[PDB]
A paper describes a structure:
[name] is an adipocyte-derived protein hormone that promotes satiety and energy homeostasis by activating the [name] ([name])–STAT3 signaling axis in a subset of hypothalamic neurons. Activation of [name] in turn drives the phosphorylation and activation of the transcription factor Signal Transducer and Activator of Transcription 3 (STAT3), which drives production of anorexigenic peptides that suppress food intake and increase energy expenditure. [name] is a member of the class 1 cytokine receptor family which includes the related receptors glycoprotein 130 (gp130) and LIF receptor (LIFR). The structure reveals an asymmetric architecture in which a single [name] induces [name] dimerization via two distinct receptor-binding sites.
To stabilize the [name]–[name] complex, we engineered a construct comprising the complete extracellular domain (D1–D7) of [name] with the transmembrane (TM) domains replaced by dimerizing leucine zippers (LepRD1–D7-zip), thereby enhancing the avidity of [name] for [name]. Recombinantly expressed mouse LepRD1–D7-zip formed a stable complex with mouse [name] in vitro as assessed by co-elution over size-exclusion chromatography. Analysis of this complex using single particle cryo-electron microscopy (cryo-EM) yielded a 3D reconstruction of the [name]–LepRD1-D7 complex to 5.9 Å resolution. Below the [name]-binding interface, the two-membrane proximal fibronectin domains (FNIII, D6 and D7) of [name] bend inwards towards one another, forming an approximately 90o angle between D6 and D7 which is predicted to bring to TM domains of each [name] monomer into proximity.
Numbering used by the authors:
A (entry chain C): 1 to 141
B (entry chain A), C (entry chain B): 125 to 824
The structure:
Amino acid sequence: VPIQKVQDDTKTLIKTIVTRINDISHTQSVSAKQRVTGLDFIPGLHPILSLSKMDQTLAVYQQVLTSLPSQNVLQIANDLENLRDLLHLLAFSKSCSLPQTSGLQKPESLDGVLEASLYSTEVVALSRLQGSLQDILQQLD
Amino acid sequence: VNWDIECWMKGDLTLFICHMEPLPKNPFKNYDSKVHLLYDLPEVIDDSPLPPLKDSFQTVQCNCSLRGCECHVPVPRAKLNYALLMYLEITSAGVSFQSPLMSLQPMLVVKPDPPLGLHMEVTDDGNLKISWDSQTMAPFPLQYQVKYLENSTIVREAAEIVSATSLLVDSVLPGSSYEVQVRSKRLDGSGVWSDWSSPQVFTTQDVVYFPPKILTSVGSNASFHCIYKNENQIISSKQIVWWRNLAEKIPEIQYSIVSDRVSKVTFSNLKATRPRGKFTYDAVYCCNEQACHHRYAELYVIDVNINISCETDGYLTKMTCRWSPSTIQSLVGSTVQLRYHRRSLYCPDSPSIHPTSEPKNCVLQRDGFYECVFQPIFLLSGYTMWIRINHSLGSLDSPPTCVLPDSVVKPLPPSNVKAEITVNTGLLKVSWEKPVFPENNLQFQIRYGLSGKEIQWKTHEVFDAKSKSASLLVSDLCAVYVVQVRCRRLDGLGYWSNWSSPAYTLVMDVKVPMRGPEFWRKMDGDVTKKERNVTLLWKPLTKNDSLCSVRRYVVKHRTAHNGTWSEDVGNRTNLTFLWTEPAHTVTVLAVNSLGASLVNFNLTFSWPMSKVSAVESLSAYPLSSSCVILSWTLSPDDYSLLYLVIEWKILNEDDGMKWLRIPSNVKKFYIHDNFIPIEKYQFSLYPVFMEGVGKPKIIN
Amino acid sequence: VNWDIECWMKGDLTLFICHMEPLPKNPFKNYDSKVHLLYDLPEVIDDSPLPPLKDSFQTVQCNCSLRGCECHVPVPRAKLNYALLMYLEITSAGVSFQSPLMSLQPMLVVKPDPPLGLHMEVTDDGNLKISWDSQTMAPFPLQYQVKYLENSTIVREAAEIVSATSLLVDSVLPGSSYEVQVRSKRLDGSGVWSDWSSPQVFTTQDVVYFPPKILTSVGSNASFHCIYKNENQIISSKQIVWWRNLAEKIPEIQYSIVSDRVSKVTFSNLKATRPRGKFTYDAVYCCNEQACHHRYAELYVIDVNINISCETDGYLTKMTCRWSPSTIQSLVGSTVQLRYHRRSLYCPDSPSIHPTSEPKNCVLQRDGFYECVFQPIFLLSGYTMWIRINHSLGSLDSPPTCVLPDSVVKPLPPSNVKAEITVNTGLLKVSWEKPVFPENNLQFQIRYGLSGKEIQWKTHEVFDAKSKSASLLVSDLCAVYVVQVRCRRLDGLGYWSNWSSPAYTLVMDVKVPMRGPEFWRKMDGDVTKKERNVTLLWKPLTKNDSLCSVRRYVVKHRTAHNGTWSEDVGNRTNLTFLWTEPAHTVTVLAVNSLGASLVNFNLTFSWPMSKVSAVESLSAYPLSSSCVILSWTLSPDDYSLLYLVIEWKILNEDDGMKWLRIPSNVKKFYIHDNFIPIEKYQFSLYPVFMEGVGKPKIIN
């Protein structure tokens, strides 16, 4: 398959999910400056550069939101599984034969915070993934 | 043999327990030692030194085990204060040992049960309250010993003895655990200490809110509290910044310091809370300046309000109270109930949620309203009512409301509503039968309009509570009218009755047709014959002339010899009759149900003045295809002409004769008709007199 | 005492069974003979001649009956290959008999279970195929003996040994019965023959169709075979003529001779079977030429070409897939299931029926289709679709279809579309709000038209995905326009949005009137009177002069003394004013919301100039009742005539006034109006100048 359509597809689908999160989080306008304790297992205070690092961040994203019990979230999860597979494919299209290793996470502090603060957890989740994909779309160029 | 004996009264004050342990250990490993407790409970305190009879002691067989013997003495509660005389008989290896008689009061030696309901809560000053229940069944004071184990950054166990059922614990340490145990003992007498209760544990967070959750209403005032611990350091109240939903920082004007470790925030005049996507409240935050803890204080604010539409039936046997749950739908799990208290007097100016309130069943209709139907009813009793919504987080009430059954009455509709036309007056008379109602204090309303697809309803009110009928002016006396009568209480209280049956007016001739028709005559018969057919030619009466109707036409004739006679002509508008007399006049009457027409024209046929020509000249001037001028000159003779009649037709057309009576004073006339110029028109001007018709002037 | 002992390992390889029969018959009728089996299962094969210890043998109490003793020795499956040491202890009448030690291996002596699943079938060549199911648990090969007996006119019995699980019998005799029995035995070793299986009976018919049924699809090929037997003789395949539904002799070109007794017909490119009343199949008849036997072959051809349509919602929440079962109702009983596999990638160039498919639940509607909503949806995942028509004759799969949700997105109509006419440019500018969508790459289609019972819609497309408003050219600047917009994906994928709400512009005067009304005067007042009422008389502006509207008429007056002043006449078209000054200049202004008409008519009244005459002749020539020519001559004096104004009225009529301004250069004019020769007419010609209207010319 041609890679230009793949790139345009990535840009379009990511901005579609941007719209999804934006208008879902409408009753959830955020102040990005506040740090609440206990969601440290979400990085994102950093620029994302490499295919491996963005890939693993996204994998963790999926994993942490697996604890999140919703339905709009479930559709977003489908979206991200699609995006994860296509980023595998784009890394392949780079013609870099770097081995694609994955996994390597511990779901305990996540579940403690889950049983703690579902409200904060989901809202910071949406907001930080927003910022994450924002830096990503900055980085794709 | 030596024995150790412990006796205490059970907490239930029903059993006296004497626990026993042998001393020393195991010199008796294979013998069945039988221990008996012989007790007496004298009923009379008599000051006579008579020894008790040996047959008065009751014997209880003690239960002996490998660890000891326990003897249970049932003591009636009425004899707890009496002296319990008892002694022990122990039989072992064939040898009986009798203990000396002992006297005791079971009330003075009771072992209370351990207290229950152990709870730890934090005051708004940051101070822990260790709370437990007092034993109600105990008729004696209790002293409690409270052993707490502060498992804080500094582990602090202390056992404290209190008589109250709550303990003051100051300055709850954030991020710490606590183990507490409590036991009790009779305050007065040789109290036996109760066993230590189950340790209740209350563990703290580095940030503690109190009261953490708030359910409240719109416009109210409330306050949260915080104790912030930054790592191992408790953050000062001067340093705790409060936040709501972390999107709005609370002004420090609404902060307050109880103690330097304890921060408090204060709010006033709340409004209804909007769900945030799925999230449905306001999240308060305790933050060390910008250091916001992951924990929170949660605020619920709801708008308290609910109405209810109660209506008393016209038969005064029930109310139907109906209300909408549309405002309750926000909080899932909220259960609603209409609570009413009935009052023997009239409704107060301010309905109040009465403590003695009964629940009411209410049925949701397909409309989405809850229907509360009350039966039987008393019209003069004030029913104080409100809605109780039982959410999971407390019970809240709608504003109480009082309804009077007599004040919500809808009367029955007026009956026997009859629409008739008063004869010779033309007035719409509506008669009806009144609905059953107390005091007959009813105000009736009548609406009427033309019967048709669109009834232009006109309303008229009957304030007279004694009136059973009313008369209304109308303009058309020959049309059907739809009439309805509704009523309500004369004082205007309650509701209007629904409109009655549509009363339809019948159409009848209120009056005889106001005029007789204008007729002309057609001559069927040559001049030579003395007999000539007079084909009269008239037209039906219009609405005004017929008024309501012309049931028939009757042509009246007069002659010199035959006198006067009439011919019932009916609905046809012509009459051919033979002319045979020198003087012959014709009159047509328009007869309706009430009689013949009043005003009627006449036309005499006379042979001598059939020769008299009162018209000198006649001319026709066609203005257009739609107009022709007729002008004529009359003879200068003093002709007493009644009127002139213009007869015009297309020549060669014997069926195109058109006639019109015009006043005799007219000299030029304008005829409006579709005049075709190629057709030749015969214009004839007949002079008409009282005694006959004059000889006409004719032009072609 | 003598025993005939048989021992075998049970078919399940769990029990070793030793059956024992005493020899001879009945010398023992009243004694309890206890037979004890002692067996040993050594675990280690050690080459040491150490006798087995007497405490090692396990004793088995055998079940002895009047017919014999059965010994049940549990042999572990792991020890089936081990040496089973065996010896017997028989005690009877107080005497114990011990048999010599016996050694055997249970695996070598196994009696298998009988073969099961004895199916029977006819091959396409006309051969008689026996088949049965092998024992899946046997760890050793099984040899099968097959006994089949042919119940034809001659009874034939055959018993055959086979190593396979099927047997073939040649030359199926039509109208013959075959019963088969199969028994198994281990191929290697002294295996014990299994008991015969249940006999399976297969009776042939005079005509044998194989396959008698074919459930096939449209365009697919079906092959049917025959062995036709007439009476006692098998009809040769050369004589077999095939017929479909007995109404269509299948051509001999479609006849394939498998054998001298087997004729084969093969349908190719099969058409969907038309429902023949109660027949949903094509009946395939084997016939000896014309002698068609009453039995046939069933041919089922279904149309599996069902189109499935899928749509994605604008909120990007769900897929809506639909399809219609119209090709399925032909066969009653077919169960259809959509089987979906969601490929993680995009859809393949060739969608394929994926083995891992998932059952999908879909609803038949009132419209006859089946909807299939997919949730959650995956944007880049290939959703492979197909219906599985599970018919009783077999399951049929629709061609696999794969859908990517992006190309099936139907847009939301844009919100808040606004339509208005720009002022002073007349451009209908339309603004709309773009609904939420990915990439905003939206091609918008508008539709606009005049407001009325029938809107002649005009459309326009918006290719710029960034545009939010546009100005448009409309025909009527004062008529209401109705506008609707719909949007789609600019790439052409997805769908079009529903058309928006009708947008209505508001009618407003885009510009002032362009010309003032033509006004003449009605001259009221005696000539001897210096004061004379001047009744100005104009007419309302047209739609072109007013453009949209004129809100009021303003008459501006000018005098030498009072200067210039204007009088608003509003909506009125006449103005009577007194003439008092020698020169009074009057100008009527047509004013709308934006102001007065730019260019306006003027008319001056002057006593000195009202005496000046520029016309000497004027003649009325009646062309017809609809036209009259006025012919006149103008002065040789150099009168600067602005224009002439023709005045005509009916004499004796003060309300038959009509006027017309004509250019001053006119000498003859045609007045086209309804004209009555009877009445006398006043034709007046008005010379108009700078100084005022000169003295006019009037002809009767």
